[PDB]
From a paper:
KLK8, formerly termed hK8, belongs to the 15 human kallikrein-related peptidases of the trypsin-like family S1A, with the MEROPS code S01.2445. KLK8 is secreted as an inactive pro-enzyme, whereby a signal peptide is cut off, followed by propeptide cleavage at the Lys15-Val16 bond, releasing active enzyme. As in most trypsin-like serine proteinases the KLK8 chain consists of two six-stranded β-barrels that can be considered as half-domains. At their interface the catalytic triad of Ser195, His57 and Asp102 is situated above the specificity subsites S4 to S4′, aligned from left to right in the standard orientation.
Upon soaking the crystals with ZnCl2, one cell constant approximately doubled in length, accompanied by a transition to space group P21, with four molecules per asymmetric unit. The corresponding 2.1 Å structure of KLK8, in which Zn2+ was not clearly identified, is referred to as KLK8-leup and resembles largely the KLK8-Ca molecule. By contrast, the P21 form of KLK8-leup contains four copies of the aldehyde inhibitor leupeptin, with the sequence acetyl-Leu1i-Leu2i-Argininal3i. Leupeptin binds covalently to Ser195 as analogue of an acyl intermediate in the canonical conformation. The P1-Arg3i aldehyde group in KLK8-leup is covalently linked to Ser195 Oγ as hemiacetal, with the oxygen occupying the oxyanion hole in the four KLK8 copies. Similar to a substrate, leupeptin forms a short antiparallel β-sheet with two backbone hydrogen bonds between P3-Leu1i and Gly216, and the amide of P1-Arg3i and the carbonyl oxygen of Ser214. The Arg3i side chain is buried in the S1 specificity pocket, which is rather hydrophobic in the upper region, whereas at the bottom the side-chains of Thr190, Ser217, Tyr228, and a water molecule bound to the Ser217 carbonyl O contribute to a polar environment. The negatively charged carboxylate of Asp189 forms a tight salt bridge to the positively charged Arg3i guanidyl group. The funnel-shaped S2 subsite of KLK8 is bordered by the hydrophobic side-chains of His57, His99, and partially Trp215, which explains very well the accommodation of the Leu2i side-chain of the inhibitor and the preference for the aliphatic Val and Leu residues in the substrate profiling. Also, the specific interactions of the P4 to P1 residues can be well explained on a structural level by the complex of KLK8 with the leupeptin inhibitor.
Residue numbers in the entry: 16 to 36, 38 to 67, 69 to 95, 95A, 95B, 95C, 96 to 125, 128 to 186, ...
The structure:
Amino acid sequence: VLGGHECQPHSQPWQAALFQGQQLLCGGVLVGGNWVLTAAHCKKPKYTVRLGDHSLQNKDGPEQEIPVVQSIPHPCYNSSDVEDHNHDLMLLQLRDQASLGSKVKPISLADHCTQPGQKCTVSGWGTVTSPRENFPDTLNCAEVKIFPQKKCEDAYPGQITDGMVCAGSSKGADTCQGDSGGPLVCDGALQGITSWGSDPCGRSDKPGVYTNICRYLDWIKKIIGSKG
Ligand SMILES: [Ca+2]
């Protein structure tokens, strides 16, 4: 996350992180008591969901390691060709219900589709510098604005689907490597998942592209309540 800042600890209680021992892999979004929503391209045979964390270095207190008992990506995603990022969406079922409260909380799914110019936020432990990469110990947040789908399609010709949405900031705020899977939150609801973006990150030329959650509400709510 560039053009951002260290969030207030546990001000994003839905924030999750995918780990392999002590290597950060991707972000995550707590959607259910026993469900995490992340980017499909973060799939790996082996990872830990880590909830209620702020500083990787130090003990914050609301840390919950949680194993995954189901890796459910979108059935229209294809992890084969690097040029296509369509349906980059995955739900991960947790082994047990996460210990809920004010520092660990499921975020609600947006029941309306977005509009260009709408206030939104992104968060992650991804690198805050581009092109040279140094990574943050603490969770970083930043504010972004969702782009019009037409201007979205102009910065990435023939790369943007209706199941995507662009979010960006002139002022330098844009997710980067390490932030995939993390949340895009608009009006206290999850509207998108960090998918892919600009080289280098933070270019005013190129925004960030996010899975469009308001499009997949039926598929998510189906497996949030029929697989859960
Ligand atoms: Ca910690």
